[PDB]
Symmetry: C3
Amino acid sequence: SAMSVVILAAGKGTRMYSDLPKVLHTLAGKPMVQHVIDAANDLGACAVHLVYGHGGDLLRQTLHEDNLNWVLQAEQLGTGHAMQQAAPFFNDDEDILMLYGDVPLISVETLQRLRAAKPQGGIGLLTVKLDDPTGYGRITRENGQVTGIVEHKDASEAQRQIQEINTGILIAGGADLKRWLAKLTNNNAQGEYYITDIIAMAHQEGHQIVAVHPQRLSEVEGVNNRLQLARLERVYQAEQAEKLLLAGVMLRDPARFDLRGTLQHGRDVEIDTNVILEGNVVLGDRVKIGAGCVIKNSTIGDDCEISPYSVVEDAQLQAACTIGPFARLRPGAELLEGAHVGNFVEMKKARLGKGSKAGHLTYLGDAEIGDNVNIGAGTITCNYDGANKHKTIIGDDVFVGSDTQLVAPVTVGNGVTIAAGTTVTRNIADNELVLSRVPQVHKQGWQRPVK
Amino acid sequence: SAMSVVILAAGKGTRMYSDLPKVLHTLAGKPMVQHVIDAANDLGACAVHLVYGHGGDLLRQTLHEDNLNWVLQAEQLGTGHAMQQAAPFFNDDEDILMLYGDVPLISVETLQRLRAAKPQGGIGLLTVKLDDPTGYGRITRENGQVTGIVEHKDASEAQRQIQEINTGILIAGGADLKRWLAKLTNNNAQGEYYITDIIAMAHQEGHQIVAVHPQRLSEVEGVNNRLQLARLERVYQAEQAEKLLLAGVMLRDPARFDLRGTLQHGRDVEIDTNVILEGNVVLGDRVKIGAGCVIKNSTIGDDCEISPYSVVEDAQLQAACTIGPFARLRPGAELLEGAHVGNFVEMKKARLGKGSKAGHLTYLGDAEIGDNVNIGAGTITCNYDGANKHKTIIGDDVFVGSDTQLVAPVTVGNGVTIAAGTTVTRNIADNELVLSRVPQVHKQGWQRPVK
Amino acid sequence: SAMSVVILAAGKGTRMYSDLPKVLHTLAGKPMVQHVIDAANDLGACAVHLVYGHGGDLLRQTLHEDNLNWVLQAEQLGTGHAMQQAAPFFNDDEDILMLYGDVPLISVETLQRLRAAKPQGGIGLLTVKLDDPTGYGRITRENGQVTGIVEHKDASEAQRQIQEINTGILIAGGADLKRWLAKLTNNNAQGEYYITDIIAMAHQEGHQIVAVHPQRLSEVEGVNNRLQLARLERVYQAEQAEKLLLAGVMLRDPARFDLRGTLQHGRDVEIDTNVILEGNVVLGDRVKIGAGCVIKNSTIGDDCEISPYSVVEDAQLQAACTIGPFARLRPGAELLEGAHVGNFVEMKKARLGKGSKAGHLTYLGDAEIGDNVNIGAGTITCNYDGANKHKTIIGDDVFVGSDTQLVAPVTVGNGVTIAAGTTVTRNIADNELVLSRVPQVHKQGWQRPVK
Ligand SMILES: [Cl-]
Ligand SMILES: [Cl-]
Ligand SMILES: [Cl-]
């Protein structure tokens, strides 16, 4: 049946020493709470109730889902209190899954299992067996069945021997939750309303608590400081790297590899050390990526070789292109089949034609360059006049001599040969050798300066 | 006496998800099977019998040894069957060592010990003691002596307690192997011919099986997927890094260091984080290599400093040169004693003289540059006319002003001073200040464009 | 009361295979012995007695403290002998703390605790409990109190069960040390004078030995080869990275982060993988540093973004500057608020004004550039005439067209527009569009060369 999610994002997060709300800090390039939001929507949540206490301006600036429902916890009185704020929105006939904005790696797979295990009228509980369960609340079981949670402060010498502890994540019916939440009190040392009281309520009423466990302990790890965040980052990258390796991408060093987004890949891709893939990256068959590349939101066709230390953002390479080492492709970079870009070359909103080469020390901006063109070393498209951008068009089979300047808007015909060092301001018709040059003069007797 | 090797390379390798035969995937820049081939030749194998079942085109394209003998296993019926295919080539009077194309790190040292331990008429067996020997066949021993291998499926509760397991690697006489292999049958669940049946044969005939162990467990690790390959890569690099550190190379971070080939080094070399050394690299005394360099098939003389993010392939630096940061030396790059190459500079088939400097934003291709030359920033040798490469020659003690173009073929004399921005097409005689320049004109009243 | 330190630096260090004295090899960019020297001065040592046996030229070249006292150990006869050489300099009324030039990570905190625990007339001893104390001398205790050190060679079956071992570091009164050191003998297998004999002396005289332990085992780790040095490097960097993370700097991968010096940082700094910080680095609030940057002795104001693979040494960025990717800032680089430096750009002794941009392929050396200037792509300040450096001055609101050359000394007025490809040699007055250009000529019928 229908189901909605409450994401708790209400801690102060002081141990982050941050002006950014804690659950907005990123993991693999996406905010922690966004991981949870995405899981809930993958589960098909009808609504996502985000309960926050601070930083509502910044949260609302960053999170936009058509089904996101914002719920202020006006005071920090505990997770049970936080649920009481969302409770007026639960439907009686829907399940309500409770999640944490700072436990980002919880998986859809685990949550689907939790949801299946919730007994009617009862509670599904996500528990984990720890080697050292000190501090955590222990799950009590009599003749196989769960009966309650005992906090560590109140556990007996023999109770503190249970290794199964409560993760805080749970699922239950909307109408039942409304019933339990209303009965919550706060007579205790901290004066808080603890959500775990509802376990005892359900048990005393005659209903069942069924527990399931995550596949990986990392799925239920929480983040309160940046050391915990960085450790979770490494765990997640490691898991991604293993999946890629097993699926048939060769990562030379999986510990020196980062994916912050998504990867579609062909067969026989090889990725060298210290590559960062960001956004949505698409790699064809037999793409080779060299040491140190950063590739963001780009598509790289079959058989391309990206040499070391290239930076690619929002670019398109067709099959069999070679870029780098030290190539810088910016949004709108576009290489046709078999094109080459060398070292210290920058492209921005620029198309390099089929089999065309710009091998050295070149800036191509706002340009359409034809097929079988040789952009000589030191060439620059002057696309900026101080106020507006202008376009440079080069035809098919053009030789642009080393250190040429094209002052856009300029069109260059097919078969043109532009001489070295020359400055191009007006158009050039087909097959015109064009040049703008002064012959060298030889001065006799010049004495070179001295200190 | 003489000895030959069988390398088994006959698995399907499906779990690699590859169009490249599995044993051709590289480890430290060399195909796995090539590691094994090299060990066998270091051992002095008279012949290397490579038994394959698939991918013979690609194997024969990649492997070339004058003593390599290709043996098709026409069907995948087990390692015992694979040996029966090589068996018609064994000489009676030679030992036959059996190796695996996907167990690349087996060492010459271990194999020499195995060979010494083979009893006459008997079998030398390579066994390893595992913390968890589950699945592997256990070595049985009575009063010290080996008597058989018990597969894990057929081991008793107490048998599964042996931690010594069969690695599959073994050595025995040619004529004995021919005798045993012929007696192999395939009445079993898998219908295969298992090479380990010959252990029981030798024992029942009255001959001995003597076992030895590898030094490191990694020596007998096999690769069936790219996760196993990547883990073996890290293990191997780590071992190489330790040897280099103990021999007196300072690696700032041995976990961020890769050698894919060989290194000869002097005293007091320092290598910073994330350096990749490929091919045959030779480093003099007191070479300093900065963060991120990639150096392939190059020789770097005493006291050179390679600053961060330089890429060097097939280059020669004499003593006391400085290149980088962001230097790109390509094949034929050649620096004489005390020469300097700065940032965003590229050399290809180019010699920079004794104490000569090209510090910024320069391409030198197909050039011989004299001693005490200052290649100004932005200089470019135009060596390519669209069809053929041409040569630029600069003499001793030449000042090439910033942003000069040399249109090869051009010779420049000694003591020449070339002015900034000038274009050089014809030769220049000694001490000629040469220039090609238009005086700047000052326009009054120009209004700069607007959006 | 007063206190002085003896640093033992007298080993041969042969296992380093080095021409540099062992204690001078660096850890986090500072010589090992300098770590110890700095701890001793933090403790307020009145004198630091450095006892060496070899390499005195190189030591004295590298170490300079106004309170450093050089003490030759003329022969390698043991640490007790080494102390006898420093002993003539101890004052009766001061404590003498004994340290080791090759145990670099010993902390001021631990040493302050050791100093507090020295009983009057007695010895403070630094001991550590090891999981495997094999080889080390065991601390003996009767009814809580220390009584002696038993070397491992002379320990009983039950003695070798003590896990508390002597680290060699100790503190005692000057006059007592002079008394004990004089009574040292060398009747033993090695013929050496062992400093640990003084423990028995103090005990037999009726005085106490009180022991304390380091916080971390790494604090008392010694370096005899470069593998041990590299492992200590990683341990130290890891500890620094944790402190930074907990203090609120986001390191994307703390294992790929190196600080060789000091860091002052604001709130919400983010540092990506493979960044090296050297010397004294100051980062403002919300600085973002990209993958691979190296930043040395520089100050980077609030909100700057340093894109990947930039190298910064002795630079100053004001608030809100953007440099990189592939930026190279050299000493004297100076960016005012909101300035931008793009890819393949180099600055040296150069100031880029408020909101000024040099985005591509540019060298700015010895230049003062005004506010709201656009340095076009390919621009070069020719500051070097072969003998002396010269200065280029550009005013406010100047458009320097792509591939311009400024031949210093040149002043450029405000509002100047310099055309593309032009060469500037004489000054330019305000609002002068300046240009130096030849119109392009179009040759008919030119046949391009062929192989
Ligand atoms: Cl590479
Ligand atoms: Cl460095
Ligand atoms: Cl990045």
